[PDB]
């Protein structure tokens with residue numbers, strides 16, 4: 232199926248494109264988009280305080296609903312940088328957003344982060360404790376048939392915190408007539424993948440208490456942003472991971488923080 | 499019912515004092531001073547606290563110090579037998595119960611227990627330490643806290659509490675070298691820190707000297723135990739202790755509050771006469787506790803000057819014996835009236 236009409240998505244992309252335009256009003260995001268274009272970067276950073284200043288209701292929708300509004304945001308950024316530049320937008324296939332500013336009730340620590348903020352955009356203080364070895368996750372896998380001389384390309388998607396069935400995550404190993412394939416690693420695409428473990432900052436925790444920690448997931452242009460012992464502040468989406476195929480569920484949903492931005496101490 | 503009926507008659511029996519004193523530990527010869535101190539210890543004082551801000555303990559702490567071969571361990575085994583809520587421990591670490599509370603997964607039950615210390619387990623009874631002088635550093639700090647505040651404070655794993663341990667301590671110790679030194683004072687005889695010693699009331703210094711009659715009777719008693727194992731009975735004493743502890747709450751309105759003050763002026767004169775271990779108002783409070791305990795011994799409900807006389811006897815005897823040899827003799831011949 233393909234969606235033909237969606238009032239929410241259409242108005243979201245309209246409002247975003249309007250906000251990110253910004254040329255007539257002080258050129259903040261015009262300057263920022265031009266900067267990331269010239270610097271060859273594709274993860275914009277966006278002041279949620281300015282977003283509230285311009286379109287407050289959009290801001291509340293963004294905060295209280297993360298994945299939908301962020302998908303709308305990144306696609307609006309795709310269209311906007313497509314307008315300002317053509318070959319650059321063709322070269323880079325998806326343009327991320329990160330969030331920043333003041334997040335009033337959602338600026339928390341790993342202790343105060345309850346399930347109330349599930350599927351929402353939190354801003355978590357606290358040190359780093361773990362940093363996994365950075366690994367590529369396959370996202371567009373190209374194969375070549377030695378017998379048939381034809382090249383195919385299976386695709387994948389970020390099913391990190393959504394429903395995921397085996398069909399999406401199959402990886403080809405045979406041709407339609409039993410003619411084994413050869414993968415083209417270089418022609419493929421990849422996305423580095425790291426997982427850190429934020430902990431409540433050791434001073435700010437109440438004394439005599441075993442500290443509270445929250446897992447964080449990192450992707451392209453965010454992996455080597457914070458080593459262990461970093462006084463990080465991660466803005467991201469707090470979500471649930473699906474325990475894979477069940478037949479009996481305890482209802483205990485593990486959680487992560489898909490980081491949409493990473494910062495160190497401001498000093 | 500019949501228990502209260504019988505022990506009321508025993509309380510009126512006119513010699514319940516000496517009767518219980520001799521009843522304490524019938525398996526031992528000699529040491530009537532220890533017997534009286536332990537009767538007062540078993541009965542204990544009465545806690546008091548002006549408002550909720552001047553907590554003074556109501557527990558008679560007795561410390562048994564002396565060279566080996568004096569049945570300190572046998573005494574504390576008897577006290578474990580006779581007292582309810584009576585736990586037994588040692589400073590080495592051999593006993594199944596330690597002195598410092600900790601949190602750990604118990605071996606048998608396999609459950610994340612908070613093993614409270616011996617002091618906490620003695621919450622409203624007696625904790626019986628043996629070899630007090632050989633306790634370790636953390637044991638010293640723990641017993642210091644439990645003596646001072648009766649509130650052991652754990653802060654280890656994720657637990658932050660200041661739970662309570664209102665136990666009477668009945669210790670045992672050996673001097674430096676294993677022979678008591680009358681030439682030197684108790685504080686350097688025993689090898690415990692003066693802040694730890696300060697929180698004690700009776701200091702039974704059990705010397706050991708070669709005496710014909712005492713040695714013969716002691717040996718005859720030990721071989722008596724051997725041949726036989728080739729007052730009150732114990733159950734009655736336990737019931738009397740329980741009944742007294744439950745309800746009798748003596749009060750000290752009728753006590754010679756001016757005689758005691760004059761006597762403490764006299765004691766402070768004799769104590770400033772030397773630079774040795776002096777008298778201080780902690781001794782007044784200990785004597786008050788001992789008087790209240792004797793009142794609870796007889797179930798009088800009100801201190802009488804016989805009770806105050808016995809409290810004076812035990813406290814002054816212990817303090818004189820705690821003083822060094824010269825000052826011991828001087829104070830003895832001065833205050834021999836008591």
Ligand SMILES: Nc1ncnc2c1ncn2[C@@H]1O[C@H](COP(=O)(O)OP(=O)(O)OP(=O)(O)O)[C@@H](O)[C@H]1O
Pocket residue numbers: 525526527528529565566567568569570571572573670671672716719720
């Ligand atoms: N006054 C006494 N009357 C009867 N038996 C005694 C007396 N003093 C010591 N004993 C005997 O001494 C034997 C060994 O003494 P015990 O084990 O009680 O040691 P202790 O003198 O308490 O030692 P420590 O203070 O070194 O632990 C015991 O069998 C006890 O019967």
Ligand SMILES: [Mg+2]
Pocket residue numbers: 570571628
């Ligand atoms: Mg012993």
